[PDB]
């Protein structure tokens, strides 16, 4: 006769590649390709002695940490399976849209693998950190302690994000409902590739800490500089106003942050600053972002 409305197809396509990660519960992981590489959060595999991953088909593997990134909270594991692996479906042509039905797949409270359903609630979110390059999708599919590192997929099973954190405590001690954040899959796949070849995420940086401010034009004002940093050596002091970075007007802090990160370390670039309403072009040699 007639059929029950269901997202079981997406579960069948995507659930076998989502794994429970343990330390011998830590969180979840996503098998990304046939070579045994697995994405998870950084905070799930931090603190861990020797990592194991458990598949829904019953297999258990020890995982080797390939690399991690703190600024995105991602990590890549590696397993050596001889019998072929299930992998998450990834559609590079798919643009995540607000209102898309999504399923969260993970191991909350070590109950076993759990599938929860919601929608994409928002895109390009910073999360709970008021300074963030994590670019979160926001979802109301229920996330709980143990979902971290798990997969968020659409109704076709295609990967939409890596579930990372929920919002559990706000004003007063109010308990929020249906506010979770996942890292978009396009970003997660790039960080995975960067981690797999370089062991870290190589990012260039300038070493400044700023705020966003006849006419006046939008700029960033230094508050702090790294002592041996690419900025301090170029001679910019606290309270300088930054107008350009490599001939790009420094108006949006999140946008110059993105730009500088993409500049490969060792590059000599102009930086237009200002002191006492005097315009000065300076030379800065970009260095690598120091890890944490």
């Amino acid at each position: 006769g007639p059929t029950p409305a269901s997202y079981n197809l997406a579960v069948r396509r995507a659930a076998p590649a989502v794994v429970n990660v343990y330390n011998r519960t830590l969180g979840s992981g996503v098998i990304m390709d046939q070579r045994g590489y697995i994405i998870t959060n950084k905070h799930v595999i931090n603190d861990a002695d020797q990592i194991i991953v458990a598949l829904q088909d019953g297999r258990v593997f020890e995982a080797l940490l390939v690399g991690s990134d703190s600024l995105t909270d991602l990590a890549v594991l590696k397993i050596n399976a001889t019998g072929g692996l299930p992998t998450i479906p990834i559609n590079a042509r798919r643009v995540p849209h607000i209102g898309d039905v999504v399923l969260a797949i993970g191991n909350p409270y070590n109950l076993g693998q759990t599938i929860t359903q919601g929608i994409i609630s928002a895109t390009g979110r910073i999360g709970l950190n008021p300074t963030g390059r994590q670019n979160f999708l926001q979802t109301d599919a229920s996330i709980n302690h143990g979902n971290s590192g798990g997969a968020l997929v659409n109704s076709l099973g295609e990967l939409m994000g890596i579930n990372t954190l929920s919002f559990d405590k706000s004003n007063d001690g109010e308990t929020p409902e249906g506010i979770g954040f996942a890292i978009p899959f396009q970003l997660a796949t790039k960080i995975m590739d960067k981690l797999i070849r370089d062991g870290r995420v190589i990012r260039g940086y300038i070493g400044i800490g700023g705020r966003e401010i006849i006419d006046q034009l939008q700029g960033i004002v230094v508050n702090e500089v790294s002592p041996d940093g690419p900025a301090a050596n170029a001679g910019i002091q606290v309270n300088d106003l930054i107008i350009s970075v490599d001939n790009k007007p420094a108006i949006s802090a999140l946008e110059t942050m993105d730009q500088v990160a993409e500049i490969r370390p060792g590059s000599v670039i102009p930086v237009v600053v200002m002191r006492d309403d005097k315009q000065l072009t300076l030379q800065v040699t970009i260095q690598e972002y120091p890890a944490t």
Partner: peptide, 5 residues
């Protein structure tokens, strides 16, 4: 409201 980069 300080941004590090």
């Amino acid at each position: 409201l300080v941004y590090q980069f």
